[PDB]
Design a protein around this ligand. Structure first.
Ligand SMILES: NC(=O)c1cccnc1
Length: 340
């Protein structure tokens, strides 16, 4: 590739490794913030809108319950998530501003992106036009080029993890399954509709699983539904491994061709995992109109800007029962989370 790209990625890796080897720790505390609203909830954690009491800045605070993390066998994953987030720097990755822990919980305080999740916008408008899908896809391609060059696999690409910012660009969040991997890794993780065949079949897999997931995402953005859909996970998995996908007639020929090469069941033949790497994707005819540098520099006018009233507006997120952030009088799971 152009020496310009090589030197860019070399500097990117240098800067990542310095932070990776000496991670930041304990850079704020809970009582520096006011709680505003619950933005999302899961089996071992939540994301909250908070406001810093001295600066007035809004942030999204991800709170993980240490005991539930242990019970659900997510210790290494949560340590991965924070160590990676504090070390990365790319225009389409959410920014970690602070992290800390207390007797009960782990906390990651990130920039608040008021525009909401791509999932909501996609379901609201039905499907994205190919130019609109391509604008988002280009950002993911560049983000994976960045991550993979750092030996990072992302492992959770799906519309809910892609926030739309004030300029209409993507911010990838939720690094809960991201991992630094040289070669192969083995954990069953991800979301059913987005899993590559080699994950389903319990193989040692590599960064090619992210390129498979990009194929799923592009299909879902352009069609309005994912390519492998069913009521039970096992039925989804049967479709994924089958090597068969049906395309809507409205898809362009170029889109179908790209998707056949991303949704390639044989990982040794899948775009993004060949000798030419990401350039097989970047040079594909479906991306012929994409100015890769302009996308990186955020100089392309976005397909749409989310509607929101200001940095504290929560209208693009939905409503959840507001539960306590309780902190035990006794330290829980201290040993397991020493490095956090
Ligand atoms: N960084 C995040 O996870 C996030 C989530 C929701 C809104 N803004 C930011």
């Amino acid at each position: 590739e152009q020496e310009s790209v090589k030197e860019f990625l070399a500097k990117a890796k240098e800067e990542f490794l310095k932070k990776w080897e000496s991670p930041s720790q304990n850079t704020a505390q809970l009582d520096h913030f006011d709680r505003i609203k619950t933005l999302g909830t899961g089996s071992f954690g939540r994301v909250m809108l908070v406001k810093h009491k001295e600066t007035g800045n809004h942030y999204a605070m991800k709170i993980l319950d240490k005991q539930k993390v242990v019970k659900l066998k997510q210790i290494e994953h949560t340590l991965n998530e924070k160590r990676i987030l504090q070390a990365v720097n790319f225009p389409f990755l959410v920014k970690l501003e602070f992290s800390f822990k207390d007797n009960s919980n782990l906390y990651m305080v990130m920039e608040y992106v008021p525009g909401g999740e791509m999932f909501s916008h996609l379901r609201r408008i039905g499907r994205f036009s190919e130019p609109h899908a391509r604008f988002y896809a280009a950002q993911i391609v560049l983000t994976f080029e960045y991550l993979h060059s750092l030996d990072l696999i992302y492992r959770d690409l799906k519309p809910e993890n892609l926030l739309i910012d004030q300029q209409g660009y993507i911010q990838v969040t939720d690094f809960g399954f991201a991992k630094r991997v040289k070669g192969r890794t083995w954990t069953l993780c991800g979301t059913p509709e987005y899993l590559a065949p080699e994950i389903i079949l319990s193989k040692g897999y590599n960064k090619a699983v992210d390129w498979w997931a990009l194929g799923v995402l592009i299909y879902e953005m352009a069609a309005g539904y994912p390519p492998f859909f069913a009521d039970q996970p096992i039925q989804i998995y049967e479709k994924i491994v089958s090597g068969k996908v049906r395309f809507p007639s409205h898809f362009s020929s170029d889109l179908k061709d790209l998707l056949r090469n991303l949704l390639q069941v044989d990982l040794t033949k899948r775009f993004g995992n060949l000798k030419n790497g990401v350039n097989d994707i970047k040079n594909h005819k479906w991306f012929a109109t994409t100015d890769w540098i302009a996308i990186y520099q955020r100089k392309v006018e976005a397909p749409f800007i989310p509607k929101f009233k200001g940095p504290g507006d929560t209208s693009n997120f939905d409503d959840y029962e507001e539960e306590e952030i309780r902190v035990s009088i006794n330290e829980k799971c201290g040993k397991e989370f020493t490095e956090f």
